[PDB]
């Protein structure tokens, strides 16, 4: 047989396409330190999309210097609390948690997620971690943070979301000193990210439930006379005669969306504090209005409105120093029009 070729339907890079095991995205990799100590991640809540008119400052671009309309995603970024410091020991079998010290004073709504750690050992726990670092038992330190969505109104939840964040520093001792500085404090998104820089966004994508192969994998429909012979949105064949099985690579129905996805190189176009700057007339549809400080991310981000979006500094970014964007106009017209 002489065959016509077609690229495979969909990607097998995200298999099995199951529901994400949590509503929070978990980062499997952390980039390398390139400066002073700081948290490598932040978490906000997706509000919605608008667009801005900005001067194209991207070097070498055809439209550089002129006004362009750029869609943006607005993400509310209230201050997160540094809840704990966790030390890790590296061995042959990988990293293991060796020590943890929780901040003495933690937010009362944290009880909705976990029973609150007491104001017990913080000086002695910190000195234990210092001894472990001095004796070489610690490979790196991470900060445990949680969001405080109670200050938001478009997000109905008051229970915090807890996640581990890396600390970027040149040395382990510097990491420990910085983490002890930030332990129990409220860190603002300006203390993590700067305007005009690239970040990676992770979220659980929009859930679509059970979907057929046409929507789930983008298989072709049956065409022409075949469209009305009774198998229109079904895969043509499940397999060959041999091997006598349906391969896992054959497109089939199943869960679509509500997966963890990471996007790369999403540029921060504005760090804002006044939520009236971005909230449209009539509010964001089904959300309401932004109240605290927010962030504008160029382009789209995974997840629907009100999902927790995790922001981390880029792991595969290419372009160097981009600059501060010159936003001439933020569209506040009705999204409901």
């Amino acid at each position: 047989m002489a065959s016509i070729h077609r690229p495979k339907r969909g990607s097998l890079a995200f298999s099995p396409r199951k529901r994400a095991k949590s509503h929070i995205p978990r980062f499997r990799a952390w980039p390398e330190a390139t400066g002073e100590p700081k948290l490598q991640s932040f978490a906000g809540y997706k509000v919605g999309m608008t667009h801005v008119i900005m001067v194209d400052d991207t070097k070498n671009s055809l439209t550089q210097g002129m006004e362009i309309s750029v869609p943006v995603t607005v993400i509310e970024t209230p201050a997160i609390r540094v809840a704990a410091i966790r030390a890790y020991a590296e061995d042959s079998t990988g990293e293991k948690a060796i020590a943890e010290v929780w901040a003495a004073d933690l937010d009362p709504e944290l009880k909705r997620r976990i029973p609150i750690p007491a104001a017990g050992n913080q000086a002695e726990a910190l000195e234990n971690i210092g001894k472990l670092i001095e004796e070489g038992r610690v490979s790196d330190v991470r900060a445990v943070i949680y969001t405080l969505p109670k200050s938001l109104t478009g997000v109905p939840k008051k229970v915090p979301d807890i996640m581990e964040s890396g600390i970027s520093a040149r040395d382990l001792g510097t990491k420990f000193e910085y983490s002890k500085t930030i332990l129990g404090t409220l860190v603002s998104v300006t203390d993590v990210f700067k305007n005009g820089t690239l970040v990676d966004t992770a979220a659980i994508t929009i859930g679509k439930g059970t979907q057929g192969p046409v929507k789930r994998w983008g298989i072709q429909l049956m065409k022409g006379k075949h469209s009305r012979q009774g198998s229109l949105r079904q895969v043509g064949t499940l397999g060959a005669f041999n091997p006598s099985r349906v391969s896992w690579r054959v497109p089939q129905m199943g869960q679509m969306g509500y997966h963890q996805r990471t996007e790369f190189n999403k540029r921060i176009l504005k760090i804002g504090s006044d939520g009236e700057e971005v909230t449209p007339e009539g509010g964001f549809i089904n959300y309401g209005l932004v109240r605290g400080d927010y962030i504008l991310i160029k382009g789209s981000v995974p997840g629907p409105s009100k999902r927790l979006i995790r922001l981390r500094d880029p792991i595969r970014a290419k372009k160097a120093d981009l600059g501060e964007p010159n936003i001439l106009y933020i569209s506040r017209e009705s999204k409901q029009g």
Binding site: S92, G94, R245, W248
Partner: protein, 138 residues
């Protein structure tokens, strides 16, 4: 507690499998990355990447990558491990990369007939080299 440094993989595996089937002891094998496989490096690497990339994903062989897991698998093939006797033998075997902290300072032994200095040539590789060329972090 057997020190696998400078030992032939198959001969050490045969010795340990017979000892486990003699059914009176728990065997610990340390420094599994330092075990030796005789033969040219190209041939051993070719055969181990052929075995590593063989099976089916839903069904097929899942050949390990860690040197300790590879050594346990090598012993696994010299046991009736689908049988109760073989399952008991595999439950009494622990293989380690380097020395685990608990076994640190314990008195070890070495199988004299599995020693790599009995080989007549320099055509050999260590198990750790195979594991790290298969992409295993250890």
């Amino acid at each position: 507690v057997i020190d696998a440094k400078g030992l032939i993989l198959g001969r050490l595996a045969s010795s340990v499998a017979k000892q486990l089937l003699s059914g009176d002891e728990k065997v610990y094998i340390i420094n599994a990355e330092q075990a030796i496989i005789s033969g040219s490096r190209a041939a051993t690497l070719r055969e181990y990447r052929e075995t590593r990339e063989r099976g089916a994903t839903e069904f097929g062989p899942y050949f390990p990558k860690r040197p300790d897991r590879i050594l346990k698998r090598t012993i696994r093939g010299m046991l009736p491990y689908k049988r109760a006797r073989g399952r008991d033998a595999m439950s009494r075997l622990k293989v380690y990369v380097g020395v685990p902290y608990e076994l640190k300072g314990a008195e070890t032994v070495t199988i004299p007939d599995a020693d790599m200095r009995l080989l007549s040539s320099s055509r050999y590789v260590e198990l750790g080299e195979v594991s790290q060329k298969m992409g295993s972090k250890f």
